Design an enzyme around this catalytic site. Structure first.
Site, PDB file in Angstrom:
ATOM      1  N   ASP A 215     -11.211  -6.389 -13.748  1.00  0.00           N
ATOM      2  CA  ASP A 215      -9.989  -6.057 -13.011  1.00  0.00           C
ATOM      3  C   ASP A 215      -9.178  -7.341 -12.932  1.00  0.00           C
ATOM      4  OD1 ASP A 215      -8.049  -5.894 -10.912  1.00  0.00           O
ATOM      5  OD2 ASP A 215      -9.379  -4.848  -9.545  1.00  0.00           O
TER       6      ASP A 215
ATOM      7  N   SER B 261     -11.424  -2.238   0.641  1.00  0.00           N
ATOM      8  CA  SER B 261     -10.006  -2.257   0.972  1.00  0.00           C
ATOM      9  C   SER B 261      -9.792  -2.552   2.459  1.00  0.00           C
ATOM     10  CB  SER B 261      -9.330  -0.929   0.601  1.00  0.00           C
ATOM     11  OG  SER B 261      -9.750   0.099   1.479  1.00  0.00           O
TER      12      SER B 261
ATOM     13  N   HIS C  28      -3.459   4.907   4.719  1.00  0.00           N
ATOM     14  CA  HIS C  28      -4.255   3.721   4.425  1.00  0.00           C
ATOM     15  C   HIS C  28      -3.543   2.420   4.803  1.00  0.00           C
ATOM     16  CE1 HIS C  28      -6.533   0.787   1.878  1.00  0.00           C
ATOM     17  NE2 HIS C  28      -7.533   1.510   2.349  1.00  0.00           N
TER      18      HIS C  28
ATOM     19  N   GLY D 285      -7.390  -1.066  19.545  1.00  0.00           N
ATOM     20  CA  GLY D 285      -8.040  -2.366  19.517  1.00  0.00           C
ATOM     21  C   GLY D 285      -7.016  -3.472  19.308  1.00  0.00           C
TER      22      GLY D 285
ATOM     23  N   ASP E  25       0.816  -1.218   0.000  1.00  0.00           N
ATOM     24  CA  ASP E  25       0.000   0.000   0.000  1.00  0.00           C
ATOM     25  C   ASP E  25       0.856   1.279   0.000  1.00  0.00           C
ATOM     26  OD1 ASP E  25      -2.177   1.991   0.857  1.00  0.00           O
ATOM     27  OD2 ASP E  25      -3.308   0.126   0.920  1.00  0.00           O
TER      28      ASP E  25
ATOM     29  N   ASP F  18      13.025   1.385   4.212  1.00  0.00           N
ATOM     30  CA  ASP F  18      12.171   1.982   5.242  1.00  0.00           C
ATOM     31  C   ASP F  18      10.800   2.372   4.693  1.00  0.00           C
ATOM     32  OD1 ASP F  18      11.010   3.360   7.373  1.00  0.00           O
ATOM     33  OD2 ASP F  18      12.415   5.045   7.284  1.00  0.00           O
TER      34      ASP F  18
ATOM     35  N   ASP G 254     -11.558   1.835 -10.245  1.00  0.00           N
ATOM     36  CA  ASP G 254     -12.868   1.221 -10.428  1.00  0.00           C
ATOM     37  C   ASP G 254     -13.881   2.267 -10.896  1.00  0.00           C
ATOM     38  OD1 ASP G 254     -11.906  -1.326  -9.549  1.00  0.00           O
ATOM     39  OD2 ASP G 254     -12.027  -0.597  -7.474  1.00  0.00           O
TER      40      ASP G 254
HETATM   41 CA   LIG Z   1      -3.913  -2.775  21.032  1.00  0.00          CA
HETATM   42 NA    NA Z   2      -8.308  -2.403  -6.742  1.00  0.00          NA
HETATM   43 NA    NA Z   3      11.343   5.231   2.733  1.00  0.00          NA
HETATM   44 NA    NA Z   4      -7.935   0.359  -5.119  1.00  0.00          NA
END
Ligand SMILES: [Ca+2]
Ligand code: NA
Ligand code: NA
Ligand code: NA
Ligand SMILES: [Cl-]
Ligand code: NA
Ligand code: NA
Ligand code: NA
Ligand code: NA
EC number: 3.4.21.75
Length: 472
Positions: free
Chosen positions: A198, A260, A86, A104, A45, A73, A150
């Site tokens: 996709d 996602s 995200h 959590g 991501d 990194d 999408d």
């Molecule tokens: Ca925790």
């Molecule tokens: Na996607």
């Molecule tokens: Na980096």
């Molecule tokens: Na996406």
């Protein structure tokens, strides 16, 4: 006696554990002693906040890289908009630390978690390949929701380096057992997208996951397609709860959303499953999901029973993931036989599509050959066709056992005149069926317009085995 996590926001994680039975049954897996210890998951991501107080304890640099800047990194790039949050949100879903007084917990809260920073820059084929192929003998499970936008009018999949990364991953990854690629089926519901368009989620090499809202409905953002395998909970309307997880700048969020957010939860469940049986192959994992997933209380208008008696939906696949059931079935699971591939070239001449085209063909599924298949896994209809307005097409494929798979639904925004070029529409809905007999391909013009085109190639590609069936 198992004691559930004491983390301050764990009671808000309604999808993990509930009295209500509207949950993923994760506590039952925890109580059996599976929490993800020894398993490595990577979020592909926009980076991971490796010093987050609810991630630091589980963080694994060996599961991480920065492909955008070309260094180890994976720290997100901090901006005023907090654009790059995200991956951190998804990481917490999988492997947020338990019992530490912070936020959590992850589904697999003792698993190791890393992230690849690869979306924050120009995402080339090479970038995708290097991310998919990151440390494939250290990382067990990859989680991703990228691919084409999408917008309901795109047909696009992995280019050559990325496709090669998928095949290398499932073949030689994880000691030969195969990398597990967990994928979100898409979020183009608003644009009436159809996710077999996709190629990332439509791949047999990705284990594809869709969403259900808290009240058990198909969320506004969801895409229906035959390639989807199963479902986890995510967000819905403003009366329904959302995903509770780690957020950028060492914060906690209760408003993580979309398909996602479903894929990471699946990746965590798959981590628990892998802990229960480290010898499961990439194909074993997909079998487990097919067999254990639960339709009950998921609302859809297209639930249908396939040839081996399982309920399947294009919105939900085989239904909600069930962690307790996964880890239970995993423990004494017998590894499936080597994958067979039966290639059947259907047409003897090109066929005018017109208003409606139906192609019927009775096949033997490579009878007498080493690729003879009596137990189907994935099936593909690889189609090459021309058409003047692509989005007016709807395409269905019916198995000999009578299972009707939607390969393509009408996409009202898709005005393309480019048709399909050997596009491998895939269905999971005939899993474990005997594919011998009559297959039917239906192509229809869903509009009142005088549209025109030609089907020039239809390859039916069957994957599966010839042994070891269960009673339906
Ligand atoms: Ca925790
Ligand atoms: Na996607
Ligand atoms: Na980096
Ligand atoms: Na996406
Ligand atoms: Cl293949
Ligand atoms: Na591409
Ligand atoms: Na292999
Ligand atoms: Na897939
Ligand atoms: Na048959």
């Amino acid at each position: 006696v198992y004691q559930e996590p004491t983390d301050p926001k764990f009671p808000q994680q309604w999808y993990l554990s509930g009295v209500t039975q509207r949950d993923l049954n994760v506590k039952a897996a925890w109580a059996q002693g599976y929490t993800g210890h020894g398993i490595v998951v990577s979020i592909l991501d926009d980076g991971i906040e490796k010093n987050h107080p609810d991630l630091a304890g589980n963080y694994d640099p060996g599961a991480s890289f920065d492909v955008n800047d070309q260094d180890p990194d994976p720290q997100p790039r901090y901006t005023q908009m907090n654009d790059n949050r995200h991956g951190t949100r998804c990481a917490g879903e999988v492997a947020a630390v338990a019992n530490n007084g912070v936020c959590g917990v992850g589904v697999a809260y003792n698993a190791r978690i890393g992230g690849v920073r690869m979306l924050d820059g120009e995402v080339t084929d090479a970038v995708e390949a290097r991310s998919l192929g990151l440390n494939p003998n250290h990382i067990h499970i990859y989680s991703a929701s990228w691919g084409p936008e999408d917008d309901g009018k795109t047909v696009d999949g992995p280019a050559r380096l990325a496709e090669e990364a998928f095949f290398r991953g499932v073949s030689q990854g994880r000691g030969g057992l195969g990398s597990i690629f967990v994928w979100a089926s898409g979020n183009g519901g608003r644009e009436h997208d159809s996710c077999n368009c996709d190629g990332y989620t439509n791949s047999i090499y990705t284990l594809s996951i869709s969403s259900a809202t808290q009240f058990g409905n198909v969320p506004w953002y969801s895409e229906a397609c035959s390639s989807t395998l199963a479902t986890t909970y995510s967000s819905g309307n403003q009366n329904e709860k959302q995903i509770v997880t780690t957020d950028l700048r060492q914060k906690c969020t209760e408003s993580h959303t979309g398909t996602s957010a479903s894929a990471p939860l699946a990746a965590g469940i798959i981590a628990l499953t892998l802990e229960a049986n480290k010898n499961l192959t990439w194909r074993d994992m997909q079998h487990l999901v097919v067999q254990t997933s639960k339709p009950a209380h998921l609302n859809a208008n297209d639930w249908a029973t396939n040839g081996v008696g399982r309920k399947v939906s294009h919105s939900y696949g085989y239904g909600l993931l069930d962690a307790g059931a996964m880890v239970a079935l995993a423990q004494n699971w017998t590894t499936v036989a080597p994958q067979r591939k039966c290639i059947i070239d259907i047409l003897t001449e090109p066929k005018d599509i017109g208003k409606r085209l139906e192609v019927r063909k009775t096949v033997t599924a490579c009878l007498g050959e080493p690729n003879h298949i009596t137990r189907l896994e994935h099936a593909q209809a690889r189609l090459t066709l021309s058409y003047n307005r692509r989005g007016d097409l709807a395409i269905h494929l019916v198995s000999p056992m009578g299972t009707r798979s939607t390969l393509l639904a009408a996409r009202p925004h898709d005005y393309s005149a480019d048709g399909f070029n050997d596009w491998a529409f895939m269905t999971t809905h005939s899993w474990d069926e005997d594919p011998s007999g009559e297959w039917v391909l239906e192509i229809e013009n869903t509009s009142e317009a005088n549209n025109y085109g030609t089907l020039t190639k239809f390859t039916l590609v069957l994957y599966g085995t010839a042994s070891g069936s269960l009673v339906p």
